[PDB]
Amino acid sequence: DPLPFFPPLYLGGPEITTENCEREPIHIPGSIQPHGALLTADGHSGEVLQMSLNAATFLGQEPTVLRGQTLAALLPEQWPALQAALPPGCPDALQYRATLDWPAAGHLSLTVHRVGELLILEFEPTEAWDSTGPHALRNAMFALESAPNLRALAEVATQTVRELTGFDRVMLYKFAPDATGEVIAEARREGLHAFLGHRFPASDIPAQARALYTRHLLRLTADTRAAAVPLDPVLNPQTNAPTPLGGAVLRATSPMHMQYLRNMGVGSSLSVSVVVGGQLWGLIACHHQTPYVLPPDLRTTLESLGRLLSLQVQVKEAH
Amino acid sequence: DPLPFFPPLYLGGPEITTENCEREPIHIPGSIQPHGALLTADGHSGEVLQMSLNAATFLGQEPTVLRGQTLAALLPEQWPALQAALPPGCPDALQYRATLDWPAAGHLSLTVHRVGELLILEFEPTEAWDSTGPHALRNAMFALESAPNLRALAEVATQTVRELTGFDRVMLYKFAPDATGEVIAEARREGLHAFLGHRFPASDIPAQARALYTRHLLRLTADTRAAAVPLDPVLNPQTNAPTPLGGAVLRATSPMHMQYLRNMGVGSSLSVSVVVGGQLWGLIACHHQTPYVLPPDLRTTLESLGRLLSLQVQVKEAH
Numbered sequence A, B: 001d002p003l004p005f006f007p008p009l010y011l012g013g014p015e016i017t018t019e020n021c022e023r024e025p026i027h028i029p030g031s032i033q034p035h036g037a038l039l040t041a042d043g044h045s046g047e048v049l050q051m052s053l054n055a056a057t058f059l060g061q062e063p064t065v066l067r068g069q070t071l072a073a074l075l076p077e078q079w080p081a082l083q084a085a086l087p088p089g090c091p092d093a094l095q096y097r098a099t100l101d102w103p104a105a106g107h108l109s110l111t112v113h114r115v116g117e118l119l120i121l122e123f124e125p126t127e128a129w130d131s132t133g134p135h136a137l138r139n140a141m142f143a144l145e146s147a148p149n150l151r152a153l154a155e156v157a158t159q160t161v162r163e164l165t166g167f168d169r170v171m172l173y174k175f176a177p178d179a180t181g182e183v184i185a186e187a188r189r190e191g192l193h194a195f196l197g198h199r200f201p202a203s204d205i206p207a208q209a210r211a212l213y214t215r216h217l218l219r220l221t222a223d224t225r226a227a228a229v230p231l232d233p234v235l236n237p238q239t240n241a242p243t244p245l246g247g248a249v250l251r252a253t254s255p256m257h258m259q260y261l262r263n264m265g266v267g268s269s270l271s272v273s274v275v276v277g278g279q280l281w282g283l284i285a286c287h288h289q290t291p292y293v294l295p296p297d298l299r300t301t302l303e304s305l306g307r308l309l310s311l312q313v314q315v316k317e318a319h
């Protein structure tokens, strides 16, 4: 049961310290990570309402020009499909995805979700050969199914995610009822110090983060030294209030957690929730030594693997 | 516990009737469906040993020319990857998949699996826009997870598979302990007669088919009037014995079952096993009124959906 959040910094909220960090409003940082661009749009008319300041880098046109234009004009070939896929009242985790062409190498991957009356559109560069078929997940299911017990399932899950992603470290981090955690399996690059069997205080993943991670099952920091890029305007004009970004992987990471990652020598981090009977059971927690953008198709594969693993854990815990 | 099979027709076995059909060797028909091509190759040297008679249609070169050539020569860009993906002793259900270019429209999809010392290579045409992302499955998982009980899960599963495939009819067919079956959910085109709630004798899916369907989880008939195309030579030269084709979706369907489908007015059929605690629990059973080749990526998506559904059933039955 998390504490209520304080206002974010851009609304005069307090600075976050180790004394108050359970109240950081991590879902509304009003900014994104710089490896992609974000727009928000009215859910009915498709009018573009907010834009990340870096949008020209990815979209080819300046934020000041794009604002107020409709998606019906900007994305004539996707707007109907997008509307149909995300009707009013749909779950905020439901996503529409499409691949767009862009004057640069590879393509742009577009991911969209709906929060209330707002559509949130994420654009990130993707290379052609950076596709992952349904086979990745399909082939992986076999070894997960043959695991004879919970610990063996955990060991195969971390090895499989490391093989699929190439991350330097992949852990299964299990929560105890007091919200402390333990690394119960780990696949890692030879020579990296082991976190296997190590336990960590509840404060390392505070209660509002655990709540968020029960609703939105994947999040990441692509570069633990990269500065966030503001949304402009920072408030959603529909509401004159902050834009919820929990459902966007481009959401800026809490600075407190960015410092934690840097202190561990981590250049890139990603985790996927394992949710069992509606409760946060654990995380598939991944590190890389250097910045790294896991491709959208692979992130989606990892999400599905998380759901599979949650069901396999739920089956085994009943036994 | 199925009866032992008789020899196949091409080894002088008996004709199959309603009196002996539990002994039809359905896994070794020595032939494939005509919408793709099949080769078999030695698992170590990659020498091509058998070829479907129609291979020139898909590969551009005549069967008589391709035989005896090595995959190292024929597929220089895939042979190393293929070898690495399917090492000796790997599960016969494990697959390697790749998309090849071919002088015709779209591409060729290549699917490979290993049985003993043999590699079995299936080639089928696929269109560019016939790709299905990991998102299809990922988005589908939500409604399956929210289903409040087993029957509701069944209803959402059939509707979801019908939405993903466009099939005229999608059923969940559940086996009873006496191997009879019941259609426990059904999504169908308006106006088609309902099979919902109908029960069927065990003989409609005989014991050797149920055994096969416990190991190889997807099979189909793309055109219920299409004649099978022989493999040549029909016997695997490694063994001087029939080539097991259970793991190839291009395997020719039992003529008995083809007639059953025609009697039902079905033009195309596909099913996916639901396997719970290693036992065949049921099938996701699909019909179309006319011939139809579900694309490889969508078939793989359906496989994964079957595994997901099996785990969700297993979770709910425990409760």
Ligand SMILES: *C/C=C1/C(=C/c2[nH]c(/C=C3[NH+]=C(/C=C4\NC(=O)C(C=C)=C4C)C(C)=C\3CCC(=O)O)c(CCC(=O)O)c2C)NC(=O)[C@H]1C
Residues within 6 Å of the ligand: A017, A018, A019, A020, A021, A022, A024, A026, A181, A183, A195, A200, A203, A204, A205, A206, A209, A219, A220, A221, A252, A253, A254, A256, A257, A260, A269, A270, A271, A283, A285, A286
């Ligand atoms: C006073 C505030 C604190 C704090 C805040 C915080 N932590 C997170 C998110 C995560 N913390 C994680 C912790 C671990 N990663 C590890 O590798 C290990 C052990 C080896 C642990 C215990 C993880 C996995 C996350 C999830 C994010 C990710 O996978 O990178 C947040 C939320 C970040 C966000 O989503 O914006 C916050 C606010 N952590 C602290 O220790 C104290 C100082």
Ligand SMILES: *C/C=C1/C(=C/c2[nH]c(/C=C3[NH+]=C(/C=C4\NC(=O)C(C=C)=C4C)C(C)=C\3CCC(=O)O)c(CCC(=O)O)c2C)NC(=O)[C@H]1C
Residues within 6 Å of the ligand: B017, B018, B019, B020, B021, B022, B024, B026, B181, B183, B195, B200, B203, B204, B205, B206, B209, B219, B220, B221, B252, B253, B254, B256, B257, B260, B269, B270, B271, B283, B285, B286
């Ligand atoms: C004497 C032999 C018989 C026989 C053989 C047979 N049947 C199958 C495979 C299937 N039969 C299925 C039956 C149903 N489909 C339906 O729509 C309904 C009810 C509405 C039923 C009861 C199904 C679903 C299959 C699986 C294949 C598929 O999905 O199309 C085989 C094996 C075919 C193969 O894989 O080569 C065989 C040998 N069926 C008979 O009724 C008797 C005459």
